[PDB]
Amino acid sequence: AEPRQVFQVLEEQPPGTLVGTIQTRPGFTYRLSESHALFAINSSTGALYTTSTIDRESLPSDVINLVVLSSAPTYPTEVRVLVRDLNDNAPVFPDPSIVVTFKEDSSSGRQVILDTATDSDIGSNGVDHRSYRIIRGNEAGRFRLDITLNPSGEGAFLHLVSKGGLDREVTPQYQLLVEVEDKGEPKRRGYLQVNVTVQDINDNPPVFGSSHYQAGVPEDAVVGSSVLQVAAADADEGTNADIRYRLQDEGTPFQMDPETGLITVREPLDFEARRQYSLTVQAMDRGVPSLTGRAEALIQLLDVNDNDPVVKFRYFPATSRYASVDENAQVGTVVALLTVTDADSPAANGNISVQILGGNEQRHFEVQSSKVPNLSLIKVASALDRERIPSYNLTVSVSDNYGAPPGAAVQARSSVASLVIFVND
Amino acid sequence: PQAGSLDLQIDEEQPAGTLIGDISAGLPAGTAAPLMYFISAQEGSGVGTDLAIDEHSGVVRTARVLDREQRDRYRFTAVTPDGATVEVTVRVADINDHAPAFPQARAALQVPEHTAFGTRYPLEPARDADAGRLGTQGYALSGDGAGETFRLETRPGPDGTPVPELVVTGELDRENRSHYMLQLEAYDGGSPPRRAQALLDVTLLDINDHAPAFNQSRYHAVVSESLAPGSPVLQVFASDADAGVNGAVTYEINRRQSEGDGPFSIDAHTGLLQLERPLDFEQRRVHELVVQARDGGAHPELGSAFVTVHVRDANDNQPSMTVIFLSADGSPQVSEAAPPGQLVARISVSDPDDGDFAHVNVSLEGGEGHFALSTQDSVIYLVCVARRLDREERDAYNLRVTATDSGSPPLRAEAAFVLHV
Ligand SMILES: *[C@@H]1O[C@H](CO)[C@@H](O[C@@H]2O[C@H](CO)[C@@H](O)[C@H](O)[C@H]2NC(C)=O)[C@H](O)[C@H]1NC(C)=O
Ligand SMILES: *[C@@H]1O[C@H](CO)[C@@H](O)[C@H](O)[C@H]1NC(C)=O
Ligand SMILES: *[C@@H]1O[C@H](CO)[C@@H](O)[C@H](O)[C@H]1NC(C)=O
Ligand SMILES: *[C@@H]1O[C@H](CO)[C@@H](O)[C@H](O)[C@H]1NC(C)=O
Ligand SMILES: *[C@@H]1O[C@H](CO)[C@@H](O)[C@H](O)[C@H]1NC(C)=O
Ligand SMILES: [Ca+2]
Ligand SMILES: [Ca+2]
Ligand SMILES: [Ca+2]
Ligand SMILES: [Ca+2]
Ligand SMILES: [Ca+2]
Ligand SMILES: [Ca+2]
Ligand SMILES: [Ca+2]
Ligand SMILES: [Ca+2]
Ligand SMILES: [Ca+2]
Ligand SMILES: [Ca+2]
Ligand SMILES: [Ca+2]
Ligand SMILES: [Ca+2]
Ligand SMILES: [Ca+2]
Ligand SMILES: [Ca+2]
Ligand SMILES: [Ca+2]
Ligand SMILES: [Ca+2]
Ligand SMILES: [Ca+2]
Ligand SMILES: [Ca+2]
Structure with a gap:
């Protein structure tokens, strides 16, 4: 009253495979109990045979209980069939290729948790979680594999430890492949790809294209014109590459466009105010911790003839309206001085001419360019009469950029003044 | 000869009427004594109100108090009635009248920690008013920590005045040394050196240095089946030594690599792991988890830890x-x-x-x-x-x-x- 047997059979076998022979009784016919499409029993004192190929992984449970039948009293002996594996499935990762991001310039020890492969087969025929290897991509020798196994039978974790030295500017991406092997009679393999995309950190500062910039500007430049153009570059990517230019000392009459780097004339210039400006330009990146690069910028102003010359006289008396000269003034004595004043530089004002107009351009008394460049002497080159000519109204001229070649852009600008002379003895 | 040249000199901010010189010394030796010295100076670029000249004698005296800050040298030509010329030049000598001075008595500087050695930070220099050797000169750093971490290298800026540049040296980490209280001193030429001083509060910024590290590598638990959903399981702990948002640790739970994280959830800012639905040993034997923590802020660092929750059964399933x-x-x-x-x-x-x-x-x-x-x-x-x-x-x-x-x-x-x- 206690007969019970157990049979064992392999999977993925052609139909009709002999499982086992149930013990027989003389004169009895046995058949199945409930109809299922996996087995059928030979009643002629036979055995148990499969009727179809079956994949063990496709079953809800391995062991399957079956009940026999009998002729008259229908005595039932129970039968259990165990189906195994043979390792027909290979290890497979949940996703073939994923992307992980690493922090560049980070010390050794930075890691990331990766996916662990799984195999549909049984325990022994399952994935060997201690056999993970990285077979390609790591030819540079940057990373390593660290596997953390769990005290619970169901669980495993894999790490991707970086040995430091990661630099985006040298190599921003690594494509790695992992080879995992099924721990089976047939060692079947699985693969996973890792797109390692390192992230950019602001480690490089902006650098200018030149160390010293030189440019010449005419002082007649209108407000808004261009002075010079600076250019910088940053080896980083994205936000750490956006450069903002600025003039280190924006108190000058210039202005820096914070994006193009074009120094413009913000206020009207003048050469006689200042000759040249020794500026310094900055270059600031938009990184999380900002950096700055510098370079000197020299701007030379170019003079133009925008100031006219004047002539002021000093004659025989000081606090007097009109000059006075004695009649017996011996020939060769100085009367007044021709002081020619010009504020502009000679580089933009040329040679200065002085001629006689409306007076005595008639050897009545000569004018002489003294040994001093601008100063001239007013003497008495002759003895004269008092009643005939008791007074004079001598005026002179003075021209900027005079004696210029034809078609010259340095046009002349002049101004005339007068000084009178009286004979009072 | 028929002409002459003469140079003169005078000190600064001396009272008016002070003697300058005599045009007689500039005339050629042996020439006649003139009756009047005709003065010819550059109009508007000139003597104007800043010199007094006696025409009948040739003596020169200062018309007002003399400042060479506006005008350093004067030049004018004196002419005799005979025709001889004397090119005169008067220079105003400098004396230390304006001592150096800083625009900020207690300036503040902000420098990121872990900064590269030798990167330079310019500062506001003590402007020299008295030009030449008497202004300008050199800075000396008197703050503490200046021998090892912060040195000063001078650089001449615009118009030649020296600009101090605080260079970076040694260690810089706000996790240990937060800020420095430096002091700056500026001197100048002249036998009595005028001085100016100012303090500098150098503070170190913070950067995402440390990732959230956990109390223990892995946690453990042995909860039974049919535990109260509102009941707690265990609390995890994580620390981050940075400041600001970089010190805020937000505890989360990884959903991918964790197997059995369904019935579980973790409090965001306390690390308390609490279940949401009851578990079954007759369904799930054990739960294996991986928890994480984010270094809050821009581009967060990531820490991680493991959680292992064993389950022991109770007789609750009917036969x-x-x-x-x-x-x-x-x-x-x-x-x-x-x-x-x-x-x-x-x-x-x-x-x-x-x-x-x-x-x-x-x-x-x-x-x-x-x-x-x-x-x-x-x-x-x-x-x-x-x-x-x-x-x-x-x-x-x-x-x-x-x-x-x-x-x-x-x-x-x-x-x-x-x-x-
Ligand atoms: C004569 O001297 C006078 C100054 O007293 C100069 O100034 C001119 O004077 C005349 C007098 O009739 C006026 O009509 C003019 O308007 C004044 N200015 C100018 C620019 O001419 C005068 O120029 C002298 N004479 C000449 C021929 O130059
Ligand atoms: C059972 O096996 C025997 C073996 O000889 C065979 O003769 C018999 O035909 C089989 N039963 C059936 C129904 O075919
Ligand atoms: C990883 O790189 C490969 C290269 O071809 C690409 O096909 C794949 O889509 C990448 N992974 C992801 C998640 O995009
Ligand atoms: C931290 O700074 C102090 C100075 O305040 C120094 O003595 C100490 O060595 C520093 N820490 C380390 C680990 O060097
Ligand atoms: C850190 O973990 C241990 C492990 O049980 C615990 O005893 C300790 O209280 C934890 N630290 C804090 C500050 O709670
Ligand atoms: Ca199978
Ligand atoms: Ca199998
Ligand atoms: Ca397998
Ligand atoms: Ca880098
Ligand atoms: Ca970078
Ligand atoms: Ca950058
Ligand atoms: Ca001008
Ligand atoms: Ca000009
Ligand atoms: Ca001119
Ligand atoms: Ca002064
Ligand atoms: Ca001075
Ligand atoms: Ca001084
Ligand atoms: Ca930090
Ligand atoms: Ca941090
Ligand atoms: Ca999951
Ligand atoms: Ca249950
Ligand atoms: Ca139970
Ligand atoms: Ca039960």
Whole structure:
């Protein structure tokens, strides 16, 4: 009253495979109990045979209980069939290729948790979680594999430890492949790809294209014109590459466009105010911790003839309206001085001419360019009469950029003044 | 000769009328003594109100207090009535009148930590008013920590005044040394050196240095089945030594690599792991988790730790059973008074098991004594016939099987049938 047997059979076998022979009784016919499409029993004192190929992984449970039948009293002996594996499935990762991001310039020890492969087969025929290897991509020798196994039978974790030295500017991406092997009679393999995309950190500062910039500007430049153009570059990517230019000392009459780097004339210039400006330009990146690069910028102003010359006289008396000269003034004595004043530089004002107009351009008394460049002497080159000519109204001229070649852009600008002379003895 | 040249000099901010010189010394030696010195100076670029000249004698004196800050040297030509010329030049000598001075008495500087050695930070220099050797000169750093971490290298800026540049040296980490209180001093030329001082509060910025590190690498628990959902499991701990948002640790739970994280959830800012639905050992044996923590802010660093929650079972799952009748067509029946010592059905017991595998005792209700119960291997049961089933004024018998679980609490399972002739 206690007969019970157990049979064992392999999977993925052609139909009709002999499982086992149930013990027989003389004169009895046995058949199945409930109809299922996996087995059928030979009643002629036979055995148990499969009727179809079956994949063990496709079953809800391995062991399957079956009940026999009998002729008259229908005595039932129970039968259990165990189906195994043979390792027909290979290890497979949940996703073939994923992307992980690493922090560049980070010390050794930075890691990331990766996916662990799984195999549909049984325990022994399952994935060997201690056999993970990285077979390609790591030819540079940057990373390593660290596997953390769990005290619970169901669980495993894999790490991707970086040995430091990661630099985006040298190599921003690594494509790695992992080879995992099924721990089976047939060692079947699985693969996973890792797109390692390192992230950019602001480690490089902006650098200018030149160390010293030189440019010449005419002082007649209108407000808004261009002075010079600076250019910088940053080896980083994205936000750490956006450069903002600025003039280190924006108190000058210039202005820096914070994006193009074009120094413009913000206020009207003048050469006689200042000759040249020794500026310094900055270059600031938009990184999380900002950096700055510098370079000197020299701007030379170019003079133009925008100031006219004047002539002021000093004659025989000081606090007097009109000059006075004695009649017996011996020939060769100085009367007044021709002081020619010009504020502009000679580089933009040329040679200065002085001629006689409306007076005595008639050897009545000569004018002489003294040994001093601008100063001239007013003497008495002759003895004269008092009643005939008791007074004079001598005026002179003075021209900027005079004696210029034809078609010259340095046009002349002049101004005339007068000084009178009286004979009072 | 017929001309001459003469140079002069005078000190600064000396009272008016102070002697400058005499034009007589500039005339050629042996020339006649002139009766009047005609003065010719550059108009508007000139003597104007800043010199007094006696025409009949040639002596020169200062018209007002003299400042060379506006005008350093004067030049003018004196002419005699005879025609001789004396090119005169007067220089104003410098004296230390304006001491150096800083625009900020206590300036503040902000420098990121872990900065590269030798990167330079310019500062506001002490402007020199008295130009030449008397202004300008050199800075000396008197703050503490200047011998190892912060040195000063001078650089000449615009118009030649020296601009101090604080260079970076040594260690810089706000996790240890937060800020420095430096002091700057500026001197100048001249036998009595004028000085100016100012303090500098150098503070170190913070950067994402440290990733959230956990209290222990892996945690443990042994919660039972059917635990209260609102009850806690365990609390994790993580630290981050940075400041600001970089010190804020937000605890989360990885959903990918964790196997069994369904019934669980973690509090965001306390690390308290709490379940949301009850778990079953007769469904899930153990839960393996991976928790994380984010270094809050721009581009967060990531820490991680493991959680292992074992489960021990309780007898809460009712016993199961299946019945198949062994007489001809599976449908329940019996013959007109069947022979004795005959069986009409088969019963097999099963249950979600911890402790005693299976081993359940069945309680077949009576059957009025014409039926019996037998067991094969304490797991499969049978149904026998007794008393020949005489059919004494009886057609069918309603029968029922009761599965009695062999656990600490009583767990029953009903299963009724009808057996006819
Ligand atoms: C004569 O001297 C006078 C100054 O007293 C000069 O100034 C001119 O004077 C005349 C007097 O009739 C005026 O009509 C003019 O308007 C004044 N200015 C100018 C620019 O001419 C005068 O120029 C002298 N004479 C000449 C011929 O130059
Ligand atoms: C059972 O096996 C025997 C083996 O000789 C065979 O003769 C018989 O035909 C088989 N049963 C059936 C129904 O074919
Ligand atoms: C990883 O790189 C491969 C290269 O071809 C690409 O096909 C794949 O889509 C990448 N992974 C993801 C998640 O995009
Ligand atoms: C931290 O700074 C102090 C100075 O305040 C120094 O003595 C110490 O060595 C520093 N820490 C380390 C680990 O060097
Ligand atoms: C860190 O973990 C241990 C492990 O149980 C615990 O005893 C300790 O209280 C934890 N630290 C804090 C600050 O709670
Ligand atoms: Ca299979
Ligand atoms: Ca298999
Ligand atoms: Ca396998
Ligand atoms: Ca880098
Ligand atoms: Ca970078
Ligand atoms: Ca950058
Ligand atoms: Ca001008
Ligand atoms: Ca000009
Ligand atoms: Ca001119
Ligand atoms: Ca002064
Ligand atoms: Ca001075
Ligand atoms: Ca000084
Ligand atoms: Ca930090
Ligand atoms: Ca941090
Ligand atoms: Ca999951
Ligand atoms: Ca359950
Ligand atoms: Ca339970
Ligand atoms: Ca139970």
